[PDB]
Amino acid sequence: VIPMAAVKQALREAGDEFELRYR
Amino acid sequence: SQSNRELVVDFLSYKLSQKGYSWSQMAAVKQALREAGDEFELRYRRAFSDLTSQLHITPGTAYQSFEQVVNELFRDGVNWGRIVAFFSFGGALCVESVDKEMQVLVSRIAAWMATYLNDHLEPWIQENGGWDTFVELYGN
Ligand SMILES: [Ca+2]
Numbered sequence: 001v002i003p004m005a006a007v008k009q010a011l012r013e014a015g016d017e018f019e020l021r022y023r
Numbered sequence: 024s025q026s027n028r029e030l031v032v033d034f035l036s037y038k039l040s041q042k043g044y045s046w047s048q049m050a051a052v053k054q055a056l057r058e059a060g061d062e063f064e065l066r067y068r069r070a071f072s073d074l075t076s077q078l079h080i081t082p083g084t085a086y087q088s089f090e091q092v093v094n095e096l097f098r099d100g101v102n103w104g105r106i107v108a109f110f111s112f113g114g115a116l117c118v119e120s121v122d123k124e125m126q127v128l129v130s131r132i133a134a135w136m137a138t139y140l141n142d143h144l145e146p147w148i149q150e151n152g153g154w155d156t157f158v159e160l161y162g163n
Pocket residue numbers: 090
């Protein structure tokens with residue numbers, strides 16, 4: 001079921017995004 | 024006793040941080056992490072709701088929910104934003120647990136977090152300039 005992986009991966013992609021927008 | 028002291032210190036650190044002043048190194052970090060969570064959570068709020076919907080939690084599957092989101096979060100390494108998500112995630116998990124009448128898990132989750140943070144993020148943190156780095160490069 002695709003949205004299982006997807007919701008996890010999106011947390012990680014947000015963290016990476018947060019990682020650069022707050023420096 | 025000394026629990027009068029915990030109360031006094033807590034009241035003072037809070038009052039101090041409002042004025043920009045920080046009681047200890049630990050008071051600084053607690054504040055930087057709190058502010059970063061609230062900020063992460065508000066910015067990626069949609070990303071969080073999608074998370075809640077996909078995972079019903081019971082006391083038997085709560086850990087599975089935890090390890091799945093955590094292992095995916097740190098799949099190909101570590102950074103500070105990912106570390107914020109980790110904290111933000113566990114805070115959300117703890118809130119869903121109390122919501123769904125399962126308050127027992129709250130301390131379990133904290134322990135899972137502490138051990139992971141201790142045994143799995145600490146080496147990266149110690150090697151990237153400790154907690155003071157992230158206070159100084161992300162905080163404020
Ligand atoms: Ca496992």
